[PDB]
Symmetry: D2
Amino acid sequence: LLHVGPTTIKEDVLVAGLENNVGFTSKEFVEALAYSLKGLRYVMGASKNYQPLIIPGGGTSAMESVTSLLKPNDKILVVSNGVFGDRWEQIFKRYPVNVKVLRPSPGDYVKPGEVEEEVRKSEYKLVALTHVETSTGVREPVKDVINKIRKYVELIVVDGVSSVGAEEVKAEEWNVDVYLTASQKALGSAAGLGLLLLSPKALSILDSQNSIAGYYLDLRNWLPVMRGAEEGKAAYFATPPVHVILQLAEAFRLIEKEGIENRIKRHTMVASAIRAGLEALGLEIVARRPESYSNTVTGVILKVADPQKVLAGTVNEGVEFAPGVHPAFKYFRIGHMGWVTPNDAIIAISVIERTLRKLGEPIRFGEGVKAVEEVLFSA
Amino acid sequence: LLHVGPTTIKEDVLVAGLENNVGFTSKEFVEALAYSLKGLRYVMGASKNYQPLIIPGGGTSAMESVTSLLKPNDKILVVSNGVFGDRWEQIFKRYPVNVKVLRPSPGDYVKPGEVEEEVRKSEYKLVALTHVETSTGVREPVKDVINKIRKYVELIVVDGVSSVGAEEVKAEEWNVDVYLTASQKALGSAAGLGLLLLSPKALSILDSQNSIAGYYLDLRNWLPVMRGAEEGKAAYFATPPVHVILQLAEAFRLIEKEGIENRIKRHTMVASAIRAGLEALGLEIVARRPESYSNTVTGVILKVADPQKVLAGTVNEGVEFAPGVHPAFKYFRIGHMGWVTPNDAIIAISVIERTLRKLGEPIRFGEGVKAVEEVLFSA
Amino acid sequence: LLHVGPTTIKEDVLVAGLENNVGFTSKEFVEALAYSLKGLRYVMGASKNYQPLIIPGGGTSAMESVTSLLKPNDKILVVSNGVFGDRWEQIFKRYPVNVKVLRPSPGDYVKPGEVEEEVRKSEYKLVALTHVETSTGVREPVKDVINKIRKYVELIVVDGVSSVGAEEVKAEEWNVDVYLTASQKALGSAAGLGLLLLSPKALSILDSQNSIAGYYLDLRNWLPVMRGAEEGKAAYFATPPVHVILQLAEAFRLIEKEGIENRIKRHTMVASAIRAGLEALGLEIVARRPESYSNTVTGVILKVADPQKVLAGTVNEGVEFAPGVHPAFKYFRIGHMGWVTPNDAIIAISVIERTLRKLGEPIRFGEGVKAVEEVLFSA
Amino acid sequence: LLHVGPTTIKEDVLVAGLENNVGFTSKEFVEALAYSLKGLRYVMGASKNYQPLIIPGGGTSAMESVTSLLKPNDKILVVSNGVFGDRWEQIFKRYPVNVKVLRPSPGDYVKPGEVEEEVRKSEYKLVALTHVETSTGVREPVKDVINKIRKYVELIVVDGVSSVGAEEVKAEEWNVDVYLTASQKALGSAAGLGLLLLSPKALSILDSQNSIAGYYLDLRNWLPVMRGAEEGKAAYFATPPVHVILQLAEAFRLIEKEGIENRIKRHTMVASAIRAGLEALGLEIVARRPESYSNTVTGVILKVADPQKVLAGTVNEGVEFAPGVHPAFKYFRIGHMGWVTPNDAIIAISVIERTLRKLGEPIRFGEGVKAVEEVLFSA
Ligand SMILES: Cc1ncc(COP(=O)(O)O)c(CNc2cccc(C(=O)O)c2)c1O
Ligand SMILES: Cc1ncc(COP(=O)(O)O)c(CNc2cccc(C(=O)O)c2)c1O
Ligand SMILES: Cc1ncc(COP(=O)(O)O)c(CNc2cccc(C(=O)O)c2)c1O
Ligand SMILES: Cc1ncc(COP(=O)(O)O)c(CNc2cccc(C(=O)O)c2)c1O
Ligand SMILES: [Ca+2]
Ligand SMILES: [Ca+2]
Ligand SMILES: [Ca+2]
Ligand SMILES: [Ca+2]
Ligand SMILES: [Ca+2]
Ligand SMILES: [Ca+2]
Ligand SMILES: [Ca+2]
Ligand SMILES: [Ca+2]
């Protein structure tokens, strides 16, 4: 069997979807969409000059919709740290475009200098980055990368599926052209939506040029719906996931009530506490470089125990554990994103200690939970 | 302003989505997906030889995913009775294919003989039909069309967004290659999913040939998820709308409990009652030919009153009314599909009588409600 | 079998109860209780000098809690128009008190003069009235009764279970000492609570005297909880139905948003429309005197059809029908209270027409629904 | 301020109450009541000869309803270990009965021999016990008490509000005449109901004798409702909390799915783990005698820190902490009952360690969490 840990959704978020006479023209729907659109500007750090869109699907449909900005034979550079970086390449194989991929050593990340070198050597229409690579837990220093490449490339896109709402994101200040995410990860809402924030530059391409996009994923077709909503008007392109968007509006209400800076600090603390627990047990982290330890995903190397058995025996344990699928390592991953609290840190390390002791993975029993406690106490 | 009436969702359906620890690998999700896949075979009248898929989006994403069955320069005949027939052509303009469209007089439908004539004259890879054309309330005699064209064309696709779960559908008996619908219409569940049933012939194309499809809407990419689910296995292509699918499973449970034959009879009675009400008021129906009066949508011609004012004054009135957007007629539309009951028939005609009397549309006040009562009594 | 029609609850009301970490000391609970307490002053027409209480149970526990105001051998006059008036007497048999009951002819009501005559003849500590007698649909002219008896009696209590939130109620202006109701009737919330509004006179009895009350239903024990809540403080006597009270707060929000005067007008219109439908069918109303036709309950006399069969064949019909249990009449009752709309009037009469036609009760088929339409149109 | 920790309710339990067209005559309600009645026999260990009742209110209304079994001047012995034992005496002061109370030293419990001595010296109609005394966390050895007193007393009643569903209960085997609980404690459902299980002997009293009971709390009045439900019949005495009972049925489904023996073991393990944590910190438990350490409540003595500050700083910390209200001790209490898991044990001790360290209560920081881990590993 396959077992990937699901991001826990606050009941308030889910319950916001229980309105049984709401459609895409309902004032309640239009208001939730307009609210979510502003919520997206807020979590991504951008002013009204940046255009938000919320489309059906997820991170993957959002990624593919970037073809809305491309023309035949356009040159694309993908900076891929693993599975989800590689998905850009799989998507672009379906399109008449030219793709080059940079990859680092397993579990590492592509340095800003290496990207800079490549964009000076060849002219690229588009550069794709992955803010956090979910398969390895590695955060790319996207700000540093962009500072170096901004003047050599027409467009920069960042996959923030595992970062937005949890890691610092400054789409406008960093001059990103498309920052995208999904509803079900670090935002902690129900699945079904892709979310995008476009620069004025990307928006001009939409408004004035043709593209290689299909029909459903051409952001041009969704623009009138998004623009209409902010003016309090209903418009129809294709039926969106109405109740999932009601749920998203409620997630954004909770996000705005906590405050994004506070949200980020919470993810830093929880992740730091979890990592301190892992280290005190003598467990090795998958991410090669400490400065890249993402605050949403941590890969945990096992020397003796079978990762698959760790996952099988922790299914009903109130944790978010998932398989490690990189040939270079034997590991499982801990998801720690969304509504995650200090108690989730304690639980994750406790569940880990007890499971690994049972399976004979050499660990310093007791030391993990104590180290977690220490971190949580000290801040 | 734009106001389209929303299909009322049974609360039980919505409430089935309130499970806050479910992801695409959860056995609860896998079971709901497998159940919904079987439910789709059931409402469409097909055996295990036909392959169901449930994908993110809606009717439009389902329609576009038909490109999964096409090759460059393939010849397509679209039989379009209005807006949603025309959407096939709009979708196919994004693809390297050759499209011819047959259209009838406004509010009429393309006769089976006219389609037969065209497919004998020229060779077509694909013929696209719309079972019920939502913009006009016209039901295409799809069975009759197919009987005549089956031996002259490789593939037949039917858009059943406004028919499946309400009109008779026999995908297997009629030998349709793709029968498709959405979650939010005559099935009466929450929005966010497209649904497809493929013949063995269409499935062989998927399994053995390349196509002009993009990435997200290539049915090949969803097949392992659908096949896995029916064997009780989780598989990942892209995150689906997990909770919308939980809701869909519950809608299919209610559909199977009523029985599809009974469901169809209910839609026939409610629609017949509503139409009898309209006629007794002296109101003219948009559909030109009575044999094509769909049992999910009825267009109502106004001679004096402004359709927009009818819609504005019936917003909180517990009905499903929508604008008429065909230049050839001045009208509004009544949606009567999903969980619709005899009481909905009475309400719709009563709300119509009272609104039109207020606005001076010449009608036989009182006679509508009486005629509805008569029909509901006699069945 | 027994079949009593349930008051339909807005989903928003129910959904307000889905908070899974709320207890009697939670700020959310205290706020909902304080809100509901004010909501009770509002629907009953009283200033802050009147003391609201919300206790576990229903109308019956509220009625019994009136013993909190009594002493051994106190004299009580019950003005009983049927079953629920008679319940006062059944309750008081359990207590060392002296009870006299006035009853009118079946389906009539006790005139104000008849009560006045009795309270001048003997001295009574307490007079009990029923605002609307649910078993017959008869509204007592409580204002007129009180105007006549106020100076001759120490305490006046009014059972408003079937009136509060639907009929005009002015507890303060009319000088009532206890006005009581339940959560599940004309207020349209979930069952589980009795609700009481006490005059300063009744409150002084609580604060300064002993009583014959038991433990759970001694309003003295609940007072500190109610007083605490309005000061934003939690207090414990016995655990209340926490989530039912969350639901009640939401019902009061909806009531206050509509406005009580508007609520009353809606009940008048719906009831008048239903009665006009009944009359046009040639059906006789149970209430003997038109000025007493309650706007929450209407008894419908059948000359031929069996009331029990009317009820059996209308169970899934979206109506609120209940048995007639008074030996003097052959009838069923229509409940029309709470969130009831003009559409409910149309439905009730339509369901009645179709059911009675099937069962051979002589009626003027078609005429009922037309008369309802006319009433709803004319206001 | 007063802050008592709320028992966390599984969302599934709450969500079972979202049926908006259900009343006391609905077959859905009757089925939920019948199911809950059987569920009550199951959790209390009794065959069909024992009669369950579910009444509005809570533990307190259930306790008072025991007056249904009493006659004027009946002699009662209350075995009270604290607040909730003392509530028997407070209730009985409202009734013409003779009460004697046995009390132990603070935080201790009345030995079976001490009760035996008293019932042999004087003749008692009724002996009242508290299975777990919530105010001190002390479990009375009710089986041992009953074995000694059974032949000397007519009736034995046990308050199991904090024991039923968590501690071993054998109502039939131990020959208890009334075993009672509430919906919101160790059963973990929504508040609003009292629950009783009566012996054949107590039932004969109901069926054949008069009593000193009031009206609402006379178990005679509820019996036809309970008997009717198990024969699949609706009956009316007073409106029950319909949706709270739907929720209760769902709680009983979850209890029966786990199995009562397993439920008991879970409470033993979680409580043992929590206590091991407390001891390893050097914290003293309020219960004087280890054999009486209840598995639902533990009192924690503080030597230096203010209990009130512990409560104030742990409000949003996902725990169930409550004040200690016995003058003889300075303490707070930990609730660990219902759906409580091993993770709740870890969290409670961690939250305690971190809070007390902050407030300078002398503890062995780190040692609590380790001891909890050890216990959870070894079971
Ligand atoms: C960085 C990143 N980019 C793109 C996607 C694709 O999103 P959708 O699935 O919404 O199309 C993701 C999604 N991440 C994802 C999805 C499913 C499983 C796991 C796992 O942890 O094993 C991770 C992701 O984490
Ligand atoms: C026959 C038909 N085909 C395709 C679609 C597209 O479905 P999605 O929107 O789920 O992609 C539809 C949708 N039907 C539809 C959708 C929105 C509004 C109205 C209206 O009545 O104006 C009708 C439809 O009715
Ligand atoms: C006027 C009146 N007074 C007291 C009560 C008792 O309330 P509780 O049940 O909440 O204790 C009521 C309740 N009314 C009631 C209850 C059950 C059935 C029916 C029916 O219409 O057949 C009516 C009532 O309508
Ligand atoms: C043993 C026991 N007996 C009777 C009751 C009364 O139950 P109701 O409240 O449902 O009538 C209880 C209630 N237990 C209870 C209730 C409220 C607060 C606290 C606290 O921890 O301070 C404890 C109890 O714990
Ligand atoms: Ca909440
Ligand atoms: Ca239901
Ligand atoms: Ca035919
Ligand atoms: Ca015409
Ligand atoms: Ca709402
Ligand atoms: Ca569940
Ligand atoms: Ca023993
Ligand atoms: Ca001590």
